[PDB]
Amino acid sequence: GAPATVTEQGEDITSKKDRGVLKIVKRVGNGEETPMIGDKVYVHYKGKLSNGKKFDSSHDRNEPFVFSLGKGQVIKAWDIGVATMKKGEICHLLCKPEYAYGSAGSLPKIPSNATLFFEIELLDFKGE
Ligand SMILES: COc1ccc(CC[C@H]2OC(=O)[C@@H]3CCCCN3C(=O)[C@@H](C3CCCCC3)NC(=O)C3(CC3)NC(=O)COc3cccc2c3)cc1OC
């Protein structure tokens, strides 16, 4: 499935070039602008452990998820990955533990040393 395809063929979007954050565009977005550090960004998403059977269903998929880009409000993989998205884009993102919850995890749902997989839809962003 998509997690395996992204693992094998995804673009490495990390500064270290450690394949720690891998991306494949699912739906091409609009324009060329991407969100900038400090912007408020608004997304829809689905996430899971990369080997999991189903996407987690413990948020309202209709409500935007909002955060300030590049401020460490979300896991590193999202700060890196959302920065690369155009408005309207949907991507797949595969996140190795160092760019997610690392050795501590977030128990019980996220074990220690967990690789994560997301589908992210960028709705909007603004610099206000
Ligand atoms: C700077 O590093 C961090 C900053 C914040 C956190 C707290 C968790 C943070 O969640 C995430 O960053 C990511 C990506 C944004 C959507 C949610 N998320 C998750 O990992 C998922 C997760 C669920 C289980 C399968 C794997 C993905 N979390 C969720 O979807 C839920 C259940 C609903 N939890 C939350 O969204 C809790 O609220 C927030 C709100 C902001 C940041 C994070 C969590 C953890 C961090 O490092 C470990």
From Swiss-Prot:
Stimuli inducing this protein: By androgen.
Domain of life of the organism encoding this protein: Eukaryota
Modified residues (N6-acetyllysine): K16
Positions of the PPIase FKBP-type domain: 30-118
Tissues expressing the protein: Widely expressed, enriched in testis compared to other tissues.
Location of the protein in the cell: Cytoplasm; Nucleus
PTM annotation: Acetylation impairs ability to promote interaction between Akt/AKT1 and PHLPP1. Deacetylation by SIRT7 promotes interaction between Akt/AKT1 and PHLPP1, leading to suppress Akt/AKT1 activation. Ubiquitinated, leading to degradation in a proteasome-dependent manner. Deubiquitinated by USP49, leading to stabilization.
Subunit note: Part of a heteromultimeric cytoplasmic complex with HSP90AA1, HSPA1A/HSPA1B and steroid receptors. Upon ligand binding dissociates from the complex and FKBP4 takes its place. Interacts with functionally mature heterooligomeric progesterone receptor complexes along with HSP90 and TEBP. Interacts with NR3C1. Interacts with Akt/AKT1 and PHLPP1; enhancing dephosphorylation and subsequent activation of Akt/AKT1. Interacts with IFI44L; this interaction modulates the kinase activity of IKBKB and IKBKE. Interacts with IKBKB and IKBKE.
Known function: Immunophilin protein with PPIase and co-chaperone activities. Component of unligated steroid receptors heterocomplexes through interaction with heat-shock protein 90 (HSP90). Plays a role in the intracellular trafficking of heterooligomeric forms of steroid hormone receptors maintaining the complex into the cytoplasm when unliganded. Acts as a regulator of Akt/AKT1 activity by promoting the interaction between Akt/AKT1 and PHLPP1, thereby enhancing dephosphorylation and subsequent activation of Akt/AKT1.
Name of the featured protein: Peptidyl-prolyl cis-trans isomerase FKBP5
Gene transcribed to yield this protein: FKBP5
Full-protein residues shown: 16 to 140 of 457
